[PDB]
Amino acid sequence: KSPEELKGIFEKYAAKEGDPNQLSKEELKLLLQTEFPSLLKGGSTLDELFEELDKNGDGEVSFEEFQVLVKKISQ
């Protein structure tokens, strides 16, 4: 794999609502659930999680901030 794949996957869910550049809170859920259920190697409340992830989304996440997830899958 490569970042491009993770970008494609990010885009895959971002494309549902709120433009393919952003992951809505509700969208991240489905994404993580399909793509990283085990890889999250933890779990927490949607708000807390998406908020940790939301470096500067303040409505929706984006590939930019989602790199924190990309880091934590190996965590």
Curated annotation (Swiss-Prot):
Q: Say which species the protein is native to.
A: Bos taurus (Bovine)
Q: Which GO terms describe its molecular function?
A: calcium ion binding; calcium-dependent protein binding; vitamin D binding
Modified residues annotated as Phosphoserine in this record:
S38
Enumerate the PANTHER family for this protein.
PROTEIN S100-G, S100 CALCIUM-BINDING PROTEIN
Write out the residues that bind Ca(2+) 2.
D54, N56, D58, E60, E65
**Key words, A-Z:** Acetylation, Calcium, Metal-binding, Phosphoprotein, Repeat, Vitamin D
Name-wise, this protein is Protein S100-G
> Which residues are recorded as binding Ca(2+) 1?
Q22, E27
Q: Where is the EF-hand domain?
A: 9-44, 41-75
Under PROSITE patterns, the record lists: EF_HAND_1 (PS00018), EF_HAND_2 (PS50222), S100_CABP (PS00303)
Which Gene3D superfamilies does the record cross-reference, listed alphabetically? Answer: EF-hand
> What does UniProt give as GO cellular component?
apical plasma membrane; basolateral plasma membrane; cytoplasm
